Design a protein around this ligand. Structure first.
Ligand SMILES: CCCCCCCCCCCCCCCCCC(=O)OC[C@H](COP(=O)(O)OCCN)OC(=O)CCCCCCCCCCCCCCCCC
Ligand SMILES: CCCCCCCCCCCCCCCCCCCC
Lengths: 113, 162, 100, 322, 295, 470
């Protein structure tokens, strides 16, 4: 139809104009303004190994986000799946909450020493 | 439909080729981010809306965030990677390359001798995937949650500081 | 009007490129990257096989594939983190003590 | 001359007009940040650059254009140039699916809010790239803390969204805004309201979750090496993200453009601007929590709340549908 | 470790010896050549073995300062981090050394009062008070009671100013940014009264040996009454808006706690000692300047 | 398809192990108690074992587009459950010396046993894939359980990378066979072809990629090199568990896939699997000639006996007693591998020389040597009945090359097995009820081996009872 291809072309125009606007603003920022030189200009700002709990938090996010995508797929068809799908999602939610309770009770999510 | 699919496939193959032949972990990670965006563009061209949307949600949004997180953990500044560059010596890579080349030849010979009337590109909405997911595939859903649980507990038990 | 064969070939170059990424690379991080290339290639092949027949089975097995991808990526990266923590290197040819 | 090409050109013009209005109100929201903090702190704010300070934003734009743009030699060039681009364009494209008025929408996608979610993923990529590219251990640890925070809130952002998804029964924005034609979604999805508000505040690098202002004394902000127009790109992206999350919130929980008497765009503008003022109030009022407290509230509280909200929403929806 | 605490290790001599030149004019003008800047930046570089850190291959080393985006001076802290836990730290001070004692050997008894003003720049007359009290002890001067009440009034005004600033900066450090604006408006009211009485805002230098510089202006009671009816509702609003906030309590309660023994053995005074239940205040234990005439 | 109460009682073992996983997890989260978690582990496995008796009373039923339960499923589920129970019983005294957290081991054992039950009941490509991955994930969990150890960590890395690669191989073949056929049901693989064009190139290529994945999974040549490294690096209960339950479950699902598929009787697939069987028997017997370590030797033995198993597989479309032969030989395999690896486990416990074992542990030496003879095909043992069954199956279908392979490989096996057996009795220079429970488990394994080698009729009748859906 005409309306759908019009919306598709509008979305593509939005994409390319946003990309071009951000790149053009960066190009204008880099092109204009004079430049300086100094000794400590290229040294970093220090005003003159870290723990793996970051990995644990990110991997926790990965697993719970995959279970979240399962919930995302379920949520758009709650009515048509009937009560049986609600029950199956209820064992899903129960397993998820049991896992989260396990992670809480063992200090996996407890960042502090 | 054809243009987006072919463009995304071309930049996809180029991107992963740049991933496997790069020395900087962050540069290769960015290249495979671009490649996963291309695979999702291929998915949207084919009409699999949920599949490409999910590829950018978690495949290009969660797993490789953990990849960049681990690169941030290690601070791989090129120690024992780029000081020799042994994977770019032809006596190392030529053999496995011709192995994968003859494998690709066999695989595309098997592919090219099958029936095909094309893909009409009719969209398959997320509600149909949700209906089938909690319909005849319920054991797959629950036991895949069990699989994610197993990966979670093993990754906790192994990846500890102590 | 896109042929199923073309998507199957595209997944095939992605899969064999992941195969080279596993084989020729000595950094285990790049090897896990190549494993992700193969798993994403298989997911793409299953998506295009589902979209050819117009069924959701390809999308469901794609979701199963990416759940496996998340699980085994976490698995390999935990193993990599422990190896780098206790060994101070990521060369896998160094991790070859067992032999016979 | 053909009516189909006329309609296509009109739709393209509408999309361009919407995009220009969004970026100009993002810059005007930087100006409104300054003015509204002045109003809320018993002062006036900038009111001498033009009438009422309305020409101040032109002066900041001129200054950050003509300031020297400098990429450090030790820093990696491509990631340094790339991270503000993502921090801008991700929340811009997250706006791109909002229906402002009937007949005024850029893309009536069948996914929508999912595309908002993957732009949030691109935002966490932007902050990660900005932190790693600086080649500075202070910015390294600061951006790792920020990225872990936004992961810990983006985990339940979608699950807070899922209550409105369940009530609407689809993913499209038009169906969401038409399911609120009788009752606004803020009343049934009140737990979704608070959880999505907290997740939007945390994912947009806003107080009380903004890392570069969380610990200025350790000098560990990941913006510390960014200057020139990259710095302005970062703040324009953050303020555009404020506008984006406000418009998402209006079109999701507050009925969008639906209103009794006023034209629909007027109601949409009023509700969005009310949530922007709510952003000002929570920035100027709420103190910043500690990092482990943020972790505990993100995981042990908000995520089970979203799960119970989705379960109760499903039970109510299936119980009401006999 | 007997290392220099106020000056860099690359320093010659000891300033408080009587033969040392006090003035920088006696020294050469401060040349900062390229080599001088390189060795001065090299001297500030922290290496763990000299300071006693004694570094496991996992302890992150962190540097805060010497520049300090806050009102309380400029200084450096070196941090040893087991992950996110501070295992050991030693403060680096001497970045604000003004040589006040050797300066006191240089100025006379009368002219030293502006230098006692800037010892702690949040006290003003509170800092001027012990110096003039000790000088009057030396000279055998017994001040009249009106002088005592005026000095008590100015000390209490500057104490309220310093406490308002401390509460504002602590609240801003927690994360609430509006009470700094309100408390600085209150500081402006206090500064109005102090400017009217003495003639300057932060450093009045208004105390004198045996008394005060001038008599009180006509109308100081009006400004004092205005500030006294302005204060308590603002203090109550301060408490109910930020101090009773649960996020601030979670940030602050139970953080860096110590008992009476740890405060006594480390010389802690003020509210740091009085928070342990030890009722030791100078104004009640050893009464001075007629502080016993106040309830 | 919807799930009926009869279907609910058909899913009894999977539901029971899932509930037991949840219960064990919550007991871990309450208080970290090693003995309580082990007790709930064995109690849940025994409850699943009794649930198989209830399922046998219930009957056989196709329950899902995915799953199917018949006597095949109950038999293999019982084999896997017995293997996991023995793994827990052997793992407790080994875990008695582990300073790190002990309670995750049983959770991983139940998750992998749940995956094995899934694989035993699997009648779908999705079910096969998910059961394989549910087997694989806590196997890397348990192989690298003692990550402080050098050998366990390198074995964990090896198994992780190789199983991920084979998983992608299998899933790519899965996608190819779906692209050719159009349905993931087991019965519709090649059903869309007839009149002589059954051998479609894309169907054959996708099937061959699945064959590559499963040949990794059952330690088949040339995907056999991972077996001794992973077996030696892993702890002894993990070696037992991987040797028994994983091999039994994936071989049962390979039986079901090659029995139900109309393309399972393809000529080219038959020749390829015959070549794989020949090479696996010959190689996995030839590697173990000069091994001084028990674990790598048992790994090569596992490769050889999986070659014997696939020899029994290759005549499933011509012969009729191939399934009975496979069931009997898997019972003998189960009892043999728990015997050998259990003696290894009680020698290696607690966590911290087979020659001259008889002068300090006489009964352990005795159970080890009878089970060593049992792996050889020596009479008065169940292994001899296994070789008798597989040789009868190979004879009745004119697989003469594979018969000669079995004979030669059995001779080499005789060499190294009785080498270890005589090494036991030479001359060389506890006090808890759980150690006695592990010894009791290995002793009833020995007595079962001896009795079923003397009178194998009850086992033959039991396996003949468990027929699948025709
Ligand atoms: C467009 C959408 C957005 C629009 C704008 C409006 C919404 C803004 C939302 C802002 C969200 C800020 C979230 C901050 C959460 C902080 C949680 C936390 O970590 O609190 C820690 C604190 C103490 O924790 P504890 O463990 O007890 O510490 C013991 C140590 N001594 O624990 C506590 O203090 C306990 C209480 C924690 C917070 C409870 C929930 C507060 C929600 C935000 C305020 C909403 C107010 C109304 C907004 C307008 C509504 C129309
Ligand atoms: C923060 C708000 C950002 C809004 C961006 C989009 C603005 C679109 C403006 C459209 C104006 C016309 C709307 C349709 C007609 C109804 C209203 C008529 C009177 C204005």
């Amino acid at each position: 139809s005409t309306e759908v291809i019009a919306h598709h072309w509008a979305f593509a125009i939005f994409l390319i104009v946003a990309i071009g606007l951000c790149c053009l603003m960066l190009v204008g920022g880099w092109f204009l303004g004079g430049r300086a030189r100094a000794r400590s200009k290229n040294v970093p700002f220090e005003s003159g190994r870290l723990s793996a709990k970051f990995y644990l938090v990110a991997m926790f996010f990965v697993i719970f986000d995959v279970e979240a995508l399962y919930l995302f797929a379920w949520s758009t068809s709650i009515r048509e799946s009937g009560w049986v799908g609600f029950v199956e999602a209820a064992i899903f939610i129960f397993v998820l909450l049991a896992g989260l309770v396990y992670l809480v009770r063992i200090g996996a999510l407890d960042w502090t020493p | 439909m054809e243009f987006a699919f072919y463009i995304c496939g071309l930049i996809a193959i180029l991107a992963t080729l740049r991933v496997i032949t790069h020395t900087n972990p962050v540069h290769a990670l960015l290249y495979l981010i671009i490649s996963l965006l291309a695979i999702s563009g291929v998915f949207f061209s084919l009409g699999a809306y949920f599949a490409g949307a999910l590829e950018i949600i978690v495949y290009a949004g969660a797993i490789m965030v953990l990849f960049v997180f681990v690169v941030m953990m290690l601070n791989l500044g090129g120690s024992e990677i780029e000081q020799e560059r042994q994977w770019l010596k032809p006596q190392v890579w030529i053999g496995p390359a011709i192995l994968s080349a003859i494998m690709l030849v066999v695989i595309v010979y098997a592919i090219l001798g099958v029936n095909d009337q094309g893909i009409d590109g009719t969209p398959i909405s997320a509600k149909a995937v949700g209906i089938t997911l909690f319909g005849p595939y319920v054991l797959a859903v629950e036991l895949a949650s069990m699989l994610l649980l197993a990966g979670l507990v093993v990754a906790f038990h192994v990846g500890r500081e102590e | 009007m896109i042929p199923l064969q073309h998507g199957l070939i595209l997944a095939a170059i992605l899969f064999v490129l992941g195969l080279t990424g596993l084989v020729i690379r000595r950094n285990l991080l790049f090897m896990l990257i190549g494993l992700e290339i193969m798993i994403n290639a298989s997911a793409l092949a299953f998506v295009v096989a589902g979209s050819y027949w117009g069924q959701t089975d390809g999308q469901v097995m794609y979701i199963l594939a990416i759940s496996l991808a998340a699980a085994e990526a976490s698995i390999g990266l935990a193993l990599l983190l422990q190896l780098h923590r206790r060994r101070q290197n990521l060369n896998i040819d160094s991790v070859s003590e067992m032999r016979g | 001359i053909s009516p189909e090409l006329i309609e296509i050109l009109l739709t393209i013009l509408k999309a361009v007009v919407i995009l220009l209005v969004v970026v100009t109100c993002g810059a005007f929201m930087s100006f409104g940040e300054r003015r509204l903090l002045g109003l809320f702190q018993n002062r006036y704010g900038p009111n001498r650059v033009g009438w009422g300070g309305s020409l101040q934003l032109v002066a900041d734009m001129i200054k950050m254009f003509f300031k020297e743009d400098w990429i450090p030699k030790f820093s990696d060039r491509v990631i340094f140039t790339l991270a503000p681009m993502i921090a801008f364009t991700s929340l811009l494209l997250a706006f791109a699916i909002v229906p402002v008025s009937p007949g005024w929408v850029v893309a009536d996608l069948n996914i929508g809010i999912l595309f908002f979610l993957m732009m949030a993923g691109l935002a966490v990529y932007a902050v990660l790239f900005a932190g790693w590219s600086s080649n500075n251990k202070y910015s390294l640890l600061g951006a790792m803390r920020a990225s872990a925070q936004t992961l810990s809130y983006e985990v339940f952002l979608g699950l807070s969204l899922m209550g409105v998804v369940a009530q609407a029964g689809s993913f499209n924005m038009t169906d969401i805004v038409n399911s609120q034609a009788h009752v606004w979604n803020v009343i049934p999805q009140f737990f979704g309201f608070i959880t999505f508000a907290i997740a939007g505040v945390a994912v947009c690098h806003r107080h009380p979750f903004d890392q570069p202002e969380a610990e200025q004394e350790l000098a560990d902000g990941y913006h510390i090496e960014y200057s020139g127009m990259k710095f302005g790109l970062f703040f324009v992206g953050e303020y555009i993200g404020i506008v984006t999350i406000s418009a998402l919130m209006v079109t999701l929980f507050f009925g969008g453009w639906q209103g009794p008497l006023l034209p629909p765009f007027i109601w949409f503008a009023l509700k969005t601007a009310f949530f922007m003022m709510m952003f000002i109030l929570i920035r100027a009022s709420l103190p910043r929590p500690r990092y482990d407290q943020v972790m505990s509230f993100g995981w042990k509280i908000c995520l089970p709340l979203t799960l119970i909200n989705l379960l109760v929403t499903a039970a109510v929806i299936l119980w009401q549908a006999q | 470790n007997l290392r220099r605490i106020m000056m860099p290790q690359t320093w010659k001599g000891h300033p408080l010896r009587k033969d040392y030149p006090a003035r920088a004019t006696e020294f050469s003008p401060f040349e900062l050549t390229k080599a001088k800047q390189d060795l001065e930046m090299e001297a500030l570089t922290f290496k763990p073995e000299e300071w006693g850190m004694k570094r496991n291959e996992d302890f992150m080393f962190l540097n805060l300062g010497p520049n300090h985006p806050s009102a309380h001076g400029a200084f450096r802290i070196v941090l040893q981090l087991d992950g996110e836990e501070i295992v050991d730290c030693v403060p680096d001070i001497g970045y604000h050394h003004r040589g006040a004692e050797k300066m006191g050997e240089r100025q006379s008894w009368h002219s030293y009062i502006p230098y006692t003003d800037r010892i702690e720049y949040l006290g003003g007359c509170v800092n001027e008070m012990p110096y003039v009290l000790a000088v009057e002890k030396l000279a055998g001067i017994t001040v009249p009671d009106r002088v005592n009440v005026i000095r008590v009034m100015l000390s209490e005004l500057f104490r309220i100013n310093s406490h308002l600033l401390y509460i504002s900066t602590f609240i801003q450090d927690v994360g609430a940014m509006t009470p700094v604006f309100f408390a600085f408006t209150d500081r402006q009211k206090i500064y109005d009264l102090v400017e009217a009485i003495t003639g300057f805002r932060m450093h009045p230098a208004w105390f004198r040996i045996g008394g005060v510089a001038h008599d009180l202006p006509r109308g100081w009671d009006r400004l004092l009454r205005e500030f006294l009816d302005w204060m308590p509702k603002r203090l109550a609003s301060y408490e109910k808006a930020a101090l009773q906030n649960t996020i601030l309590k979670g940030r602050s309660q139970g953080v860096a706690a110590y008992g009476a023994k740890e405060a006594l053995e480390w010389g802690t005074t003020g509210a740091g000692l009085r928070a342990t239940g030890i009722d030791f205040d100078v104004r009640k234990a050893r009464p001075y300047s007629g502080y016993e005439n106040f309830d | 398809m919807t799930i009926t109460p009869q279907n609910l009682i058909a899913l009894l073992p999977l539901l029971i192990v899932g509930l037991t996983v949840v219960v064990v997890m919550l007991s871990i989260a309450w208080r970290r108690n090693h003995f309580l978690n082990a007790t709930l582990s064995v109690i849940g496995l025994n409850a699943a074992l009794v649930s198989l008796w209830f399922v046998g009373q219930a009957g056989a039923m196709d329950v899902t587009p995915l799953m199917r339960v018949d006597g095949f499923a109950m038999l293999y589920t019982g084999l896997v459950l017995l293997a996991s129970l023995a793994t827990c019983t052997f793992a407790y005294p080994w875990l008695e010396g582990y300073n790190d957290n002990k309670d995750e081991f049983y959770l991983l054992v139940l998750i992998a046993a749940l995956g094995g039950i899934l694989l035993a009941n699997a009648n779908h490509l999705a079910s096969l894939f998910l059961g394989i991955e549910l087997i694989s994930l806590p196997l890397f969990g348990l192989v690298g359980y003692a990550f402080r150890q050098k050998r366990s960590l390198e074995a964990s890395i090896k198994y992780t990378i190789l199983s991920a690669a084979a998983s992608s191989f299998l899933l790519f073949g899965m996608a190819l066979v779906y692209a050719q056929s159009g349905d993931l049901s087991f019965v519709a693989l090649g059903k869309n072809l007839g009149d002589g064009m059954l051998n479609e190139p894309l169907l054959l290529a996708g099937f061959g990629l699945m064959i590559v994945g499963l040949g990794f999974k059952l330690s088949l040549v040339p995907f056999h090199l991972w077996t001794p490294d992973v077996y030696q690096g892993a702890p002894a209960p993990v070696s037992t568990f991987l040797a028994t339950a994983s091999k039994i479950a994936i071989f049962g699902v390979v039986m079901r896939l090659f029995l139900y598929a109309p393309v399972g009787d393809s000529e080219a697939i038959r020749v390829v699997l015959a070549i794989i069987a020949f090479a696996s028997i010959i190689f996995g017997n030839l590697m173990a000639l000069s091994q001084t370590n028990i674990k790598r030797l048992l790994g090569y033995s596992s490769i050889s006996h999986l070659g014997y198993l696939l020899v029994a597989l290759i005549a499933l479309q011509t012969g009729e007693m191939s399934m009975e032969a496979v069931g009997v030989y898997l019972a003998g395999y189960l009892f043999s591998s728990l015997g050998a690896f259990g003696v290894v486990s009680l020698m290696s416990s607690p966590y911290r020389s087979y020659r001259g074992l008889f002068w300090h542990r006489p009964i352990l030496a005795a159970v080890m040597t009878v089970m060593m003879l049992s792996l050889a095909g020596i009479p008065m043992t169940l292994g001899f009945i296994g070789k008798f069954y597989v040789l009868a199956v190979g004879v009745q279908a004119h697989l003469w090359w594979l018969v000669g392979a079995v004979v030669v490989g059995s001779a080499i096996g005789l060499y190294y097995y009785l080498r270890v057996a005589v090494s036991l009795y030479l001359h060389a220079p506890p006090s808890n009820w759980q150690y006695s429970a592990g010894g009791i488990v290995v002793l009833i394994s020995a007595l079962l081996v001896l009795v079923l080698g003397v009178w194998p009729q009850p086992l033959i009748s039991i396996v003949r009872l468990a027929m699948p859906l025709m």
